[PDB]
């Protein structure tokens, strides 16, 4: 035996394929030699512990570097006129102009400007000095050490959990719902009330005095007597200055709604009340399922009894408890789908309802956060469907799942796939046709012939929320409606003030260009879903390959017979859907960035007029906004944007290098490598050296992955460079 230890088949490969495939199959515990279920579960547990340790170390490193090399104490005094510092630069390759150019902020040497928004987040939660950040970093280092220690302990024979413990679903659901959500959110309200709210009013509360300072003048008396309205009295005034006692109040729980007048962000007393309410809701809900105390629900009986008596769903949900409980890919897919949905929601909500002070005025940070979270959500959404296909291949049992909801989906896969195809074709046809018609109309110098369609439904929905720029006068926009009268004394004043102010990002005004780009987004989503669903459902076989389940999740082809069978596996269906995900997220981020750039420059009419034809996009977004970026270094000198131009070109080069592995396939290269072996063996003074692994071309599936990684890395780096350079050159 030799590397890999966990594969007898791989360890006997006489070629270089032994190393590549040894690296790529390390974390697939199910396919290792002499693997059992208990060992699988225990390895997963240890890996989770390691992941937590890595996360804690990452956060500790960020905090330590900001405390040691940043300008946090200078930024706190004048947040709007200081640039945050990420860390310092020490590059022996730098020249003197590079040393001078990157010396920005208040530093004594080259530094990097942070665009992750950690400064605003930490300032909002009450951190004020570099001593606080050092303590936080030390605490997180301790937490990482504790996580590693806990990871090592449960791999010992005395402390190994059993498989039955891992399959106790009701106890885990109860404990997670009640403590990991309810108690976790209850404690954050405590931190807010005791530390963060006093800090925003000029009060310094730390470990040495937090037992003597009352968060409220009346103490806990109102809480136990039910006089809970005393905690909302005397809120902060509109003339409040954040961080000082000028114009401050004494309330700790309010329902004002809207934004803080100065920081242009949510009130700190609204978030505490929100977290308290959700903590109570989560604490109550964690008492549903049955444990060894003799009361509660049983999930299996809940599933088995939800069958309609009409028979239109067959046997219903019977047998689904054991299907989910015995498959880990099913659980991973469900978790990934939920996580991706909530990540997209986080991205959509953070840009329009900012929570951190002075982050709405930082234009570069907002775009970076939005793009980051949207790309991550897209990748997670692809992974959900990938693991659904893996479940259908490896874990599904037809006999236990007879005629239930899961089995009837495989029965009519053709209808689902064909209807998805119809929707995609319809959307693509008409969207492209309208765009090309508008382009041709602009080309002939007659813009009045364009097809411009108002997004009436979205404008009506915006009016129903209290916006008065369209004159629809419905619901919340109606002063005499019951809905308006219900909340007019609680939250409507502040919300209506915020929604009818046009300098923020709360319910931006929309037009025909928004309509066209929204339908493009819909086309992208439908096509990606079509690809992934077709890959998942056809995983066990089709007419072209009835026995696909016998060949695994990933395999090259079934050869040139029967007309040829390239890309017939479900893995190849996942591989083709990454290109569509990247395209869709690119469209979404292009739309967001152009709209917000035009909004920030105060010339929204440019987007309104130039977004109805594709030449408008190409000329007024890409060509126009890339002038500063491509001038980072020129024959006349360099400035602080040099690194972003270099990364722009680097991303272009990495993206194009991926096309080599995607367009040219293996048999060209194995023949080319065969001549080099002869050349080396016949060369004097060099044939005294010989290899140990026989050199070979990459495998058919390897080159698909290697090409796709190059494509994604180039995409990400190029867009990140362009976005950051374009935003920071104009707005700093």
């Amino acid at each position: 035996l030799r590397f890999p230890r966990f594969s007898q088949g791989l360890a006997q490969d006489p070629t270089t394929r032994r190393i590549w495939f040894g690296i790529a199959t390390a974390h697939d515990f199910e396919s290792h030699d002499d693997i059992t279920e208990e060992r699988l579960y225990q390895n997963i547990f240890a890996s989770h512990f390691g992941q937590l340790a890595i996360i804690f170390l990452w956060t500790s490193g960020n905090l330590f570097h900001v405390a040691w090399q940043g300008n946090f104490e200078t930024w706190v005094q004048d947040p709007l006129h200081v640039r945050p510092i990420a860390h310092a630069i020490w590059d022996p390759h730098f020249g003197q102009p590079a040393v001078e150019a990157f010396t920005r902020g208040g530093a004594l040497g080259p530094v990097n400007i942070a665009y992750s928004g950690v400064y605003q987040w930490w300032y909002t939660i009450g951190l004020r000095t570099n001593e606080d950040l050092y303590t936080g970093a030390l605490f997180l280092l301790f937490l990482s050490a504790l996580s590693l220690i806990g990871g090592w302990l449960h791999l010992q024979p005395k402390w190994k959990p059993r498989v039955s413990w891992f399959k106790n679903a009701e106890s885990r659901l109860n404990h997670h719902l009640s403590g990991l959500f309810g108690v976790s959110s209850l404690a954050w309200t405590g931190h807010l009330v005791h530390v963060a709210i006093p800090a925003s009013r000029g009060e310094y509360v730390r470990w040495n005095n937090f037992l003597n300072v009352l968060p409220h003048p009346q103490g806990l008396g109102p809480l136990f007597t039910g006089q809970w309205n005393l905690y909302a009295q005397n809120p902060d005034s509109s003339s409040h200055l954040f961080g000082t006692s000028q114009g401050s109040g004494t309330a700790i729980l309010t329902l004002l709604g809207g934004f803080h007048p100065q920081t242009q962000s949510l009130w700190l007393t609204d978030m505490a009340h929100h977290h308290l309410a959700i903590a109570i809701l989560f604490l109550i809900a964690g008492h549903m399922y049955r444990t060894n105390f003799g009361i509660g629900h049983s999930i299996k009986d809940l599933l088995e009894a939800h069958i309609p008596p009409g028979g239109r769903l067959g046997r219903g949900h019977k047998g689904l408890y054991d299907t989910i409980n015995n498959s880990i890919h099913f659980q991973l897919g469900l978790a990934l789908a939920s996580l991706g949905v909530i990540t997209s929601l986080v991205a959509q909500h953070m840009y329009s309802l900012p929570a951190y002070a002075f982050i709405a005025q930082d234009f570069t940070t907002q775009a970076a956060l939005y793009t980051h979270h949207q790309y991550i959500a897209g990748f997670i959404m692809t992974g959900a469907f990938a693991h659904g296909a893996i479940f259908f291949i490896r874990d599904y049992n037809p006999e236990q799942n007879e005629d239930n909801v899961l089995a009837r989906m495989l029965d009519h896969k053709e209808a689902i796939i064909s209807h998805l195809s119809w929707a995609s074709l319809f959307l693509g046809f008409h969207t492209l046709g309208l765009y090309v018609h508008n382009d041709v109309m602009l080309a002939f110098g007659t813009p009045e012939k364009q097809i411009l369609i108002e997004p009436i439904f979205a404008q009506w929905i915006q009016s129903a929320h209290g916006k008065t720029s369209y004159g629809f006068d419905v619901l919340l926009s109606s002063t005499s409606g019951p809905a308006f009268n219900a909340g007019r004394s609680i939250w409507l004043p502040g919300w209506l003030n915020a929604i009818n102010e046009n300098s923020n990002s709360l319910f931006l005004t929309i037009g025909p260009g928004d309509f066209l780009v929204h339908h493009a987004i819909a086309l992208g989503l439908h096509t990606t879903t079509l690809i992934l669903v077709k890959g998942a459902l056809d995983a066990r076989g089709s007419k072209l390959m009835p026995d696909k389940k016998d060949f695994g999740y990933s395999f090259p082809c079934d050869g040139p017979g029967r007309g040829g069978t390239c890309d017939i596996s479900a893995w190849d269906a996942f591989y083709l859907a990454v290109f569509w995900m990247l395209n869709t997220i690119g469209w979404v981020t292009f739309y967001w960035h152009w709209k917000h750039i035009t909004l920030w420059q105060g010339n929204v009419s440019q987007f309104n007029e130039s977004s109805t034809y594709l030449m408008g996009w190409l000329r007024d977004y890409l060509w126009l906004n890339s002038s500063q970026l491509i001038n980072g270094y020129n024959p006349f000198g360099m400035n602080s944007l040099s690194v972003w131009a270099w990364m722009f070109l680097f991303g272009h080069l990495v993206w194009a290098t991926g096309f080599m592995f995607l367009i040219s396939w293996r048999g060209y290269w194995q023949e080319l490598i065969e001549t080099l072996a002869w050349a080396h063996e016949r060369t004097p003074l060099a044939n005294l050296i010989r290899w140990k692994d026989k050199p070979v071309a990459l495998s058919i599936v390897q080159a698909r992955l290697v090409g796709l990684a190059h494509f994604s890395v180039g995409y990400i780096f190029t867009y990140a460079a362009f976005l950051i350079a374009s935003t920071s050159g104009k707005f700093g």
Partner: protein, 31 residues
């Protein structure tokens, strides 16, 4: 400070060399 003048070369030139040598010796080993 003077610390970056040490740790940057330590992490960029010394540790990669040690790790690559050890890993190559590990992957080339047989019994």
């Amino acid at each position: 400070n003077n610390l970056p003048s040490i740790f940057v070369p330590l992490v960029g030139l010394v540790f990669p060399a040690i790790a690559m040598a050890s890993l190559f010796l590990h992957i080339q080993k047989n019994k």
